[PDB]
């Protein structure tokens, strides 16, 4: 084993991207050792769909996709197939037949500056519901009424709102970092396996 | 997009911006009440002004959506609460006049001082100077001096301000399409659009008066018994058939007869249950008190306090340099932040207050899932009623013995039960005629049924007739004795204390039945009963989302306020009072006065 999959960057990045513009990293052509994942952070909401976690070292996939972002405590449960809300509807939606794992852990220490960590935004309004595995980084003013908007107004709203993360909040409002691993095997031989 | 859909999106934008701005104002207000500095006063004002300006802007924007075109009632409730004009319906000149009158009356009340004769320097404020006199002094003349001087030197300053206050408040209420300012206040109990649960503003007057007629027999025997005991202490001051002198009632106004307990105690040789010595014997601290309170709510199926509660609250006096406002309060800053501010001492009173205040926290955590505009009690009397029933169970000997503060060998006889019920009636029953008569006077003043040249004349005719209390000094129309109370000169509705009192015994009687309690209602402890906790939580989580008549029905099974549980609580005393008054005159003559 000489080429370990670079999980040292996904679970230990200096800062994570906003949920509406969640970051996607591709992991391939490497040996995947998930046993070290528990050493990265005290995982709170580890959950795998379509695959038993204890057998993660005994499977192979063509490519792995890590989608990393930051949400609130209440919105962690929205990261699941067939779920609805704000994050699952207008920010980041998983397919109904999703296969992979979800790892969510608290980051109250790194994403709470006591004055409002307003660098993490989420999409509040959208014309339609987000398609699975789609990013909508568009920043056009949202129209709620019938009049033209061409900018902010009484019924013309900015689609993105900034989280007000602070360390004084409860566990339900403290920021949580989420990494969703999706496993894919289309045609190519699996370049990702276990030890 | 329809108007209702635009309002749902408008309320969606409002909730997220309000929760942030409300948290900034609540945190800045917390840092002042826990660290009274000059920098914290400005930061509290700056954050409070930004929150007040945000509401005024959103109220105008909310008034651009016609309520008639909204059919979803949960959306209409949030729009209706946000569209409430209030003082913003008057002209800018009249609203500026009204806010100046309100600030002056609050300043006159909080700064009004009375100086003893022959020393223009030895002056006393209401708190603590005059209040200490009205609560501890047994001297007739000393209490008469404090009672009269507070009303002739501070109340007379409020008389001209209160006349213009009624005019502008009536113009404000009538511009909001209300009959008068009293009808405006009664809108807190109004319910429309819900078949079988509606409630009109005028119905509150009829229900308060109807239930008060059933309280009269209990109060007359409590009044007669108190008069007899006080007549033995002041034989030359009290008539056996007249009303009670207003300055001999336990406080500045007779709002509570609690302090009359020393002179009216039935069996003055059996001591009260005071587990304060036991708490010090067991090295209890403030954290132990709140931990025991936390265990209480957990025993009935309610959640434990959040980690941020134990970390952010101030459960002890900061002491030394850092000063703080030691009044016990429960804080719901929002966004999962719940705190309790309290300079807790190792006493039995603070032990029961901790259960009273943590009950407010349980209420807040329950409806925290509701929208921002629906996070409150069902009406103005719900929140305080939930806190009262917690100290009811926590103070019983059954509960005090189950936690190791009261000795198991300590037995309770019917003489200590009467002493407890009499102490309770002096505070609970003694305040109901005071509260109803005061609020009825303001209802009639706002309605225009009492002319200005007969304000004080009608005020004391109703004190003699309804409350059975006579003024010791004749007062002309230069006085303003109602304004000598905080709530009247600071513009607060008062009927909330009448409805809350009847609510809490409805709650307690219902929860104790769910707890399968046997025996008198006053000995009940709902501890370890998850069934009672489930029945209470079914109303706490509602918040303001449902009509208060429906929220009340989830606990007690009835849609309206009921006085029978209150009478069921005091029945062992009522039968004892009637036996004590067999050779005494029950009732009062309104023509007798101590200055006749
Ligand atoms: C209270 O205010 C004083 C005045 O600046 C400050 O020195 C102190 O640290 C403050 N205490 C807290 C707990 O904020
Ligand atoms: C009213 O609107 C809320 C969202 O604002 C929705 O959850 C609820 O189901 C609606 N109720 C009815 C009866 O349409
Ligand atoms: C608010 O006041 C305006 C006039 O200032 C009035 O037309 C409107 O009906 C009022 N609305 C409410 C909800 O009080
Ligand atoms: C409440 O009690 C449960 C155990 O019943 C515990 O797991 C939880 O951490 C407690 N909550 C807090 C805030 O301590
Ligand atoms: C409640 O249960 C606890 C044990 O769970 C017990 O110690 C306590 O005495 C009980 N109290 C009552 C009033 O039943
Ligand atoms: C208390 O009960 C005893 C009998 O158990 C009775 O003789 C006495 O009169 C009662 N006293 C009161 C005040 O009820």
Numbering used by the authors:
A (entry chain A): 329 to 523
B (entry chain B): 19 to 614
Task: Give passages from the manuscript.
BA.2.86, a recently described sublineage of SARS-CoV-2 Omicron, contains many mutations in the spike gene. The characteristic spikes on the surface of coronaviruses are formed by trimers of S, linked to the virion through transmembrane helices at the C terminus. S is made up of an N-terminal S1 domain, responsible for attachment to the host receptor angiotensin converting enzyme 2 (ACE2),2 and a C-terminal S2 domain, which through conformational rearrangement executes fusion of host and viral membranes, allowing entry of viral RNA into the host cell cytoplasm, initiating the infectious cycle. The RBD is positioned at the top of S and can adopt a range of conformational states, from a fully exposed “up” conformation, able to interact with ACE2, to a more hidden “down” conformation.
